[PDB]
Each structure stands twice: as C-alpha cells, then as structure tokens.
Amino acid sequence: PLPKPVLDTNGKELNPNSSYRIISIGRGALGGDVYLGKSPNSDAPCPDGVFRYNSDVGPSGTPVRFIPLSTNIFEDQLLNIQFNIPTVKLCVSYTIWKVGNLNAYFRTMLLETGGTIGQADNSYFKIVKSSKIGYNLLSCPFTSIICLRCPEDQFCAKVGVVIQNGKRRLALVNENPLDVLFQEV
Amino acid sequence: PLPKPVLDTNGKELNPNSSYRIISIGRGALGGDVYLGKSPNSDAPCPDGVFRYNSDVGPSGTPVRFIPLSTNIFEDQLLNIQFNIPTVKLCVSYTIWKVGNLNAYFRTMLLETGGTIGQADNSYFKIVKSSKIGYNLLSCPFTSIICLRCPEDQFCAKVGVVIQNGKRRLALVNENPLDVLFQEV
Numbered sequence A, B: 001p002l003p004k005p006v007l008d009t010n011g012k013e014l015n016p017n018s019s020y021r022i023i024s025i026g027r028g029a030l031g032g033d034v035y036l037g038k039s040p041n042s043d044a045p046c047p048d049g050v051f052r053y054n055s056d057v058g059p060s061g062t063p064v065r066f067i068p069l070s071t072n073i074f075e076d077q078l079l080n081i082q083f084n085i086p087t088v089k090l091c092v093s094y095t096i097w098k099v100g101n102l103n104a105y106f107r108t109m110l111l112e113t114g115g116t117i118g119q120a121d122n123s124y125f126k127i128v129k130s131s132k133i134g135y136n137l138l139s140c141p142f143t144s145i146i147c148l149r150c151p152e153d154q155f156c157a158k159v160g161v162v163i164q165n166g167k168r169r170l171a172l173v174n175e176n177p178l179d180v181l182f183q184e185v
Helices: none
Strands: A020-024 A034-037 A049-052 A064-068 A079-083 A097-103 A108-113 A125-129 A135-139 A157-164 A167-173 A180-184 B020-024 B034-037 B049-052 B064-068 B079-083 B097-103 B108-113 B125-129 B135-139 B157-164 B167-173 B180-184
Touching: A020 A034, A020 A064, A079 A097, A079 A125, A097 B097, A108 A157, A135 A180, B020 B034, B020 B064, B079 B097, B079 B125, B108 B157, B135 B180
Parallel strands: none
Antiparallel strands: A020 A180, A034 A049, A049 A108, A049 A167, A064 A079, A097 A108, A108 A167, A125 A135, A135 A157, A157 A167, B020 B180, B034 B049, B049 B108, B049 B167, B064 B079, B097 B108, B108 B167, B125 B135, B135 B157, B157 B167
C-alpha cells in the first residue's frame, strides 16, 4: 500500500499550505458546500457546527485547510481539518473540526468545532476514495483508545449528513457517505 | 466459535435471573470490589460513577446483574450491566452501566450509570476471558455506528481503571485490563 496523494478539482495534489472548499459531487437540490454554522442551542461563544448547504445556488462553502501528521496529504491518513477564516483569539479552536458527544436523538456523533490540532481530541479525520465519484471523509475518534482487533487499533466511521432543524448537519453515518470534491479557493 | 458460558466463583454458569459482585483477582492492596459511587462534580441526582475499592478489607461490592441480548450469558456477546439495589423511581437508570463522554484529562471514556437496557445508548458490554486469571470486561460503545473493517462492525475497548480524585474509577483503557471474578450474592 503506497501513499496516494489526494487531488483537488484541478487534479493538483492537496496541500497543507493552501485551502479548499468541500463541495458536493452533485448539482442543484443535491448540491451544497460544507460550511461553518451555528449549532442549535449550543453553549459555545462561537459558531461550532459543521453543515452543508441545501443546494449549490446559495453561498459558497467555508474554506478549510488540512493538517496531516507528517508533511503531506494522502488518502487514509489521520489529519486535522480547520475552517480557514479570520477570527478573534477566542474562536480559533471553534474553526478546528472534531466530533462531538454521543447524540441520543441521532444515535451517532455530530461534527462540530472546538477541536485541537495535533493532539488526540476526536479531531482526526481521513480522506478516502468514494465508491461513487469523488471522496468521502472519515472520522477517526478516540485515537488514544485501542479499538480491539481494528485496523491499526483505530475506530473509524464514515462521515455523512443528518437533518437537524431542517439543515444538513454533518455526522457519523453508516450508509450514504457524503461524496465530496475539494475546490482550491 | 461456539458460545462459551461465563462462570461464577463456584463454577456455576452466569445467569440473568441472579446477581453477582464483581471482585478482584487479587488480594489486599490489589483487591477491591467494583461498586456504585458518586462521581466527582456530577450533575446527576443519583450516584452515577463506577468504581472499585482500594483494597478488599473495606466493604463488599455493589451487586450487579447481567442482561444479555437473548437468553444466556456467553463470553464476547453484548450485554447490559445493572447495579441491583433498592432505588427510588428517579435513580433506576443510574444503576444501569454505560460509558460516558470523552474525558480530555484521561483521554478516554469513564464508566458511569444512567444507561438504558436493550437499546443503543453506550450501555453495552462484553465479558471475555482474561490473559491472566479470571475475566475482563469490554465496553462496546456506539453500536449504532459502523466501525470500519472492525469485528462485527463494532468498536470495542478493554475496561480498566484510572485514578480520579484518588479513587479507582473504571474507564476504557489500553493495557492492564481489570481482572475480575463474579461472586454470586
């Protein structure tokens, strides 16, 4: 298994020193870029929810960058994800992606912000090739805990969408992972 | 792989219609039964922490029963664990074992109560044979989420102990699982 670089919509290799919008494979009603929005009834002082839009005719996504363990971005390696936007000191962690507590209503964990870069705070994700066109994301939570007889001892789950207060909220899912492309801003 | 019943300290097969104390393999300073205690700074109206005593010369453990998916208790099958003690209506769920939210200090999840029986609420455990003498427990959290390329799609972790406010708090761990025996009350 030799490390395969991740490609953006121009075929260029994904790259830590740059930023991309996470865009839907689809168009119209099935389109909608990922963005940073306010989570319903959150106690956070900042926007802390990871959503995608209902269509592609609205606004463009919130740009993100990827932070790998080493130097490069390959498929199936732990990385941090961070919304790349101007921000006051307080809300800097609320741009870093992570996975939240178990949600009894949805029977899974929602994607949110308030994570950390380069630690073990449920803030690790993987980019892998989709079955259909494009990529999907994985959340690899609890890196400090051995998942018994798991690949590389790690719990990993596909990232998809749940409907929460009529919005497309990103969360861990079982079928239909969100199929994405990466568009360099 | 044929289902192997779990045995109590008298060699009798573990059994849903009865109750057991979860006792340490060891003696003295290394002994100490599992019990239901108050978690430090918990908002719960009831005792909601799963601990074991510092030695065996103190009190005896809190009795528990096991609730399997089918009819019997075998090694390596999901079951619920519940402290079996008199209780007001309010505190009944706070006798059912479950695993809590990610704890930043310990980099793992602590065992607590407030779980549910027969659902998907991080309330599932497994009893398996220890490497050393006796058994260990597993927590199998997030049964509603596919753990990718995992055994039976399930995230499972060994149950051990962390030191929290000088007490032996049960939690998910990586090395040194708590080695236990089951003693019929």
